[PDB]
């Protein structure tokens, strides 16, 4: 519905009823956003693409415990009463003001049989004063580390255009750890540590449709203008149904003889 | 169905049959074999093509949010093609199945007039 | 609701397959998340009880792989593979679906 | 991460008692709170749920209109009233967290990730 | 990409074997017919089809 | 261009720091200037196709 | 074998014996360790390609 | 001509002529050039294709 795929991995108050599902259908809507906060995902199509096949998604802790310095983000667009921020995810903002921010080093070790999801945020804000008074003054630096994964990255802050009520933008970053795997973040400032790890649950397959569900079909595939149930092997409806069905084609109706060539007297 | 002038609009429960003419009447009868054997055939090649496939496609392509613009291409090129050879194999199945069953059609037609003609050496003879 | 439990404790030895049940008299399955609200709980002699398992299915991080949660609309299994020294306790199924939380009436096990 | 606990003692039925359960090592604001009763012998048995903002409170129907359940932020802590005691609560009193972010799912009454040690209550007859 | 592919041969290989699998067929009926009408047409009245 | 950031990584291989090796490809009659101020794994020798 | 055909460039010790080859047939195996120090390699699948 | 495609978006000398064309086929050379002052377009191919 109102939320979206990407959301119940960050958590927005529109993905709170769907953010440790089960199913074997995912179903994904126009309106659904991924974000309460504006942001973006990097590399955002793989991530829908792993997601669609999690099967659902199990939640982990991650047990990254901050002593000394504030992490209750908050903010007026990520809203339900008051001001909040997500759910899986943790703002490591300064101790009460304009103060340094320490070089944190977490690691979190993935002890699972199955290779977990995790994602992290990145935050540049709408001046450098705002990341001054978030997180303090100097060139912040956050290395992300693992056996597969070693990309590392600096928070950019500037002006934006107004988006959803904020100026700033978290990009949304992500990673698979292998089993017996660790990954290691080490933020100095601007960071959007993740609170709870993404375990993936089995096999399932996302659609993104438009129309209401119904539970009356032993439906095959299914797309924006609904379900193809048919034994035909071609069909005409829409040319990227995902699922096991009739195939596409560029003709109206084909029409296969099945009696004989006909003569009227 | 070539040598006949046009088929029958009165015969109604079989596909070949039978008219009578004779010295008692006027009567229509329907074969049972060569009908029965055309059917099977023909709902057989019916069976062998209506079938949902066995591969499970997946979502390549998202609608909402658009996909960056050269792998988007990419995927919007390849799907093309493959709709372009599915449209072609579709139409290439359903052209040659329709003409083999309307060579099959014909074929039985001709079975039974050949195992006719058989069946009566110089009793009876055709007209054309 | 009522959360209703197996029979009493088991004099089960090390390494036999632990079986515990809990039986409801409504459906704690919702068809909008499909998770199944129920959660499984362990009460060492003394010390308050952990969670094993949560959702009926997914397992802790501080657990091992030997309790397994079986769920469904209204039966409940756990299966322990084996039992050691460190797994005898007492346990509870409580569900979350509806109000009030109802917990189980406690498996205690015996080695 | 773990809760602390102070109040519990020897109370007569009837009275007023103050119970308190201060937290620490995570975001207290966040996740939903509950308190559950474990009676010496007997099987554990739930109290009261407070959400995240507190205007959601949930409660057992044998302590329905009578306990009430707070929670402070600002603070870290969270308080449950003693109103008209009897003789079977008589049991140790935990303050486990709900295992829910922000109060998430189409519940708000989570289950319990981790738990306090407990102080127990006895009345005297 | 490749599970497309993999599918439009599957399907070319299964119609190719159908299709030739008939076409084997009816040539042998072909050749058959083709003998039987060549001994029909040496055998003018001295001898006669039989069914 | 890029930057090199230190930071806290696992041991893979019973090390920390990580080498990330870029790569490109030179057409004949041309060259390539490399600019450091540090941290770099200089190319000893270049390598060519050969069929 | 337990050489890499990336590693062929960069000259881990296990690549050193195929560290300039000539062949018309490469073969690669899961042991194949690219690296030694260890690190990824920008545009992977683009360089093993070519 | 010896104008490039992404040119027309930018404005080298050579695309001068072509800077806001409007043409049903539009035709590239092999001795088009994109830019004067060196430089190279970022996601090359997502731009050439729009
Ligand atoms: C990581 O640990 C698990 C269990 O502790 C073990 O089964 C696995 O083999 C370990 N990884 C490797 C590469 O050995
Ligand atoms: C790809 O095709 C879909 C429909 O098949 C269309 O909606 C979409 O706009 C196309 N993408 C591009 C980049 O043209
Ligand atoms: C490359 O340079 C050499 C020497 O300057 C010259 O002989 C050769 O023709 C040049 N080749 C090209 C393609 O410019």
Same mark, same amino acid.
């Given at each position: ?265 | ?128 | ?111 | ?19 308190? #359960? ?72 935990? #303050? ?11 519940? #708000? ?17």
């Amino acid at each position: 519905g109102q939320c979206g795929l990407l959301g119940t991995i960050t958590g927005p108050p529109q993905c709170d009823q769907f953010l440790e599902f089960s199913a074997d259908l995912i179903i994904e809507r126009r309106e659904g956003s991924d974000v309460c906060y504006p942001g973006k995902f990097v590399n955002e199509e793989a991530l829908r693409q792993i997601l669609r096949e999690s099967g659902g998604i199990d939640k982990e802790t991650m047990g990254f415990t901050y002593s000394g310095i504030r992490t209750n983000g908050a903010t007026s667009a990520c809203r339900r009463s008051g001001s909040s921020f997500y759910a899986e995810m943790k703002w490591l903002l300064s101790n009460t003001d304009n103060a340094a921010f320490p070089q944190m080093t977490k690691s979190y070790k993935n002890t699972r049989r199955d290779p977990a999801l995790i994602v992290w945020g990145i935050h540049h804000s709408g001046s450098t004063t705002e990341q001054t008074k978030l997180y303090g003054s100097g060139s912040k630096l956050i290395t992300v580390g693992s056996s597969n994964y070693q990309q590392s990255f600096v928070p950019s802050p500037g002006a934006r255009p107004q988006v959803n009520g904020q100026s700033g933008r978290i990009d949304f970053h992500w990673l698979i750890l292998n089993p017996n795997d660790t990954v290691t973040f080490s933020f100095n400032g601007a960071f959007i540590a993740p609170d709870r790890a993404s375990f993936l649950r089995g096999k399932s397959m996302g659609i993104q449709s438009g129309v209401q569900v119904d539970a009356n079909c032993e439906g095959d595939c299914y797309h924006s203008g609904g379900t193809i149930i048919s034994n035909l092997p071609f069909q005409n409806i829409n040319s990227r149904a995902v699922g096991k069905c009739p195939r596409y084609v560029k003709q109206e109706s084909l029409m296969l003889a099945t009696g004989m060539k006909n003569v009227p007297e | 169905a070539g040598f006949i002038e046009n088929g029958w609009e009165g015969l109604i429960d079989g596909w070949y049959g039978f008219r009578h003419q004779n010295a008692q009447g006027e009567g229509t009868a329907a074969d049972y074999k060569s009908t029965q054997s055309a059917i099977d055939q023909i709902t057989g090649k019916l069976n062998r093509l209506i079938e949902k496939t066995n591969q499970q496609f997946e979502l390549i392509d998202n609608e909402f949010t658009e996909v960056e613009k050269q792998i988007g291409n990419v995927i919007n090129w390849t799907r093309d093609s493959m709709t372009e050879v599915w449209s072609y194999n579709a139409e290439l199945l359903v052209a040659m199945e329709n003409q083999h069953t309307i060579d099959l059609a014909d074929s039985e037609m001709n079975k039974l007039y050949e195992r006719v003609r058989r069946q009566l050496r110089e009793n009876a003879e055709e007209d054309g | 609701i009522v959360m209703t439990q197996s029979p009493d404790s088991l004099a089960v030895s090390l390494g036999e397959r632990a079986t515990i049940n809990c039986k409801s008299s409504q459906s704690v399955l919702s068809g909008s998340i499909n998770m199944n609200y129920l959660a499984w709980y362990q009460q060492k002699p003394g010390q308050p009880p952990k969670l094993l398992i949560y959702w009926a299915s997914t397992r802790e991080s501080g657990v091992p792989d030997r309790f397994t949660g079986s769920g469904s609309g209204t039966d409940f299994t756990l299966t322990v593979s084996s039992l050691q020294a460190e797994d005898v306790a007492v346990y509870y199924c409580q569900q979350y679906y509806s109000t009030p939380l109802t917990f189980g009436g406690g498996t205690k096990v015996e080695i | 991460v773990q809760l602390v606990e102070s109040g519990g003692g020897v109370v007569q039925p009837g009275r007023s008692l103050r119970l308190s #359960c201060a937290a620490s090592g995570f975001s207290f604001s966040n996740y939903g709170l509950h308190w559950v009763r474990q009676a010496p012998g007997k099987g554990l048995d739930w109290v009261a749920v407070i959400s995240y903002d507190g205007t959601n409170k949930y409660y057992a129907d044998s302590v329905k209109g009578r306990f009430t359940i707070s929670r402070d932020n600002s603070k870290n802590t969270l308080h449950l009233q003693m109103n008209s005691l009897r003789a079977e609560d008589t049991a140790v009193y935990y #303050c486990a967290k709900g295992r829910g972010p922000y109060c998430s799912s189409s519940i #708000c009454y989570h289950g319990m990730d981790v738990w306090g040690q407990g102080t127990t209550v006895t009345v005297s007859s």
